[PDB]
Design a binder for this molecule. Structure first.
Ligand code: FAD
Ligand code: FAD
Ligand code: 6A1
Ligand code: 6A1
Ligand code: ZN
Ligand code: ZN
Lengths: 228, 228
């Protein structure tokens, strides 16, 4: 029995991202997995890190420090409920898939806000208790990303550099920092310019990969893997 | 007579970030520069890329494609006023300074949202205006970032990798892509653990740097600069 959370960041259900999300739901559901989707846009998920995220007395009301106050709020159980709702989904999951279009070599801001607000100290990491000792150890994560740029554009000698370069802040700085083991990314390059057959092939490749996802091992999430 | 825009992303005016922003305002104002600050949290700036960003008739009401719709809205002058207000500030500026704390090896979500929503096709880049030919060519950009981690953690073989590694999506994937020439980043490492005198040294380094900012040459914003 496995539990999967899909954190999904696209505005349009008929989009290529939406199709990739649905085939993940369909395939993991068919396998008998428990599946939950956080559809951030449909949830109107709040991306801003503000003092509204702490619902009780601040430890220092004179000078607001988001990190200090959210860590204390986590321990006291005074974080906003939208944050703890996401934390419950993550805590229960064996695998967290992030499904998103690449925006500025990174995640859409709504998804960046989920990272900023959900992965607070005490929940996702502690100091000490990060990278291999992070608090989400034992869990897997996987980035399923779509791009405008082609695969050739995302090579070492291409104008955008290798695709693994833009994965570093997400895979290493975020997921590995929190103790996740990271499965190899699923990058669906340039669906907007792919042919109809090429798009269907990309959707089928993801569905096929998910059939055997539980047999995969994580990547070595190191500088060498990303930069060689 | 130079014009500067500071895009500032911190919740607390008394923070180290707030102080770096105020030193920049004071010093650039003293030089006789024209200075504008976009204080994103005070503006409650919207980070989400949604259909509310277009005020006109959608080019395709059946299927929402954020990039297509914003490109068309830019051309038809029907973007939301919060976006067009920011575009005016950028259009007028000779230098754009981004002042932020590092969140998950990147910008806080509110600032990511400014990038996502302000830098639309037609305004910041197009086919074929990108990288050196980007539409904001002629302008300078500078990242002034504060970190939790120490300089030693941000080395090639340190736990976090070189700081240049996390700069790639921001400096290259975003600023260079839009045609900015990128001035060397200002990285203020670990002010929360630094001594009083170290903090003062880091602020003064920034104030002093700002005295000669117009004499600087841009970095070569290449994969080699970042990873080599
Ligand atoms: C703010 C912003 C920043 C960006 N920054 C970057 C960047 O830094 N680097 C980069 O490379 N790109 C960037 N892009 C481009 C972006 O990554 C792509 O536009 C996006 O990944 C395309 O995915 P989509 O789901 O929106 O595609 P869609 O336009 O929804 O899909 C493309 C086509 O596939 C079709 N389709 C949907 N489902 C199926 C299916 N099941 N089978 C067959 N076809 C199907 C759709 O109908 C459509 O015709 C950026 C875009 C924006 C808006
Ligand atoms: C969601 C989140 C994600 C994060 N991700 C990362 C990450 O990926 N990598 C990483 O390294 N860090 C990360 N951090 C830590 C973050 O980058 C630092 O906490 C932030 O950079 C500290 O800057 P600050 O302005 O908030 O410091 P502050 O705590 O406001 O300032 C530090 C000290 O300097 C003092 N000070 C202010 N002005 C002056 C002045 N004029 N002269 C002397 N002292 C002054 C303050 O009073 C304070 O005592 C993260 C934090 C959060 C909340
Ligand atoms: C670093 O490479 C980028 C950076 C920003 C980008 C893009 C690519 C990119 O391909 C697109 C984009 C947008 N805003 C920022 N970016 C909108 C859409 C876009 N790609 C789709 C357009 N086209 C011509 C494929 O249909
Ligand atoms: C990739 O390195 C990280 C990633 C996330 C981090 C931090 C460092 C970091 O130093 C902090 C942090 C927070 N949320 C995510 N992160 C809150 C505060 C924090 N700052 C460290 C110093 N200390 C112990 C004063 O909080
Ligand atoms: Zn790693
Ligand atoms: Zn570059």
């Amino acid at each position: 029995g496995k539990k999967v959370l899909i954190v999904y960041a696209h505005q349009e259900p008929k989009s290529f991202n939406g199709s990739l999300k649905n085939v993940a739901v369909d395939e993991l559901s068919r396998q008998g997995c428990t599946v939950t989707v956080s559809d951030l846009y449909a949830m109107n998920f709040e991306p801003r890190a503000t003092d509204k995220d702490i619902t009780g007395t601040l430890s220092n009301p004179e000078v607001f420090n988001y990190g200090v106050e959210t860590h204390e709020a986590y321990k006291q159980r005074s974080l906003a409920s939208d944050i703890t709702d996401e934390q419950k989904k993550v805590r229960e999951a064996d695998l967290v898939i992030f499904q998103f279009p690449l925006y500025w070599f990174s995640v859409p801001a709504i998804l960046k806000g989920w990272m900023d607000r959900v992965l607070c100290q005490g929940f996702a990491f502690d100091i000490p208790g990060f990278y291999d000792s992070g608090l989400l150890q034992g869990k897997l994560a996987l980035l399923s990303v779509t791009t405008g740029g082609t695969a050739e554009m995302y090579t070492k000698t291409g104008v955008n550099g290798d695709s693994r370069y833009f994965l570093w802040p997400l895979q290493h700085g975020t997921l590995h920092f929190c103790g996740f083991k990271v499965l190899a990314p699923q990058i669906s390059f340039a669906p907007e310019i792919a042919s109809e057959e090429e798009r269907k092939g990309m959707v089928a490749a993801w569905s096929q990969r998910l059939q055997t996802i539980w047999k995969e091992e994580p990547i070595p999430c190191t500088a060498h893997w990303h930069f060689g």
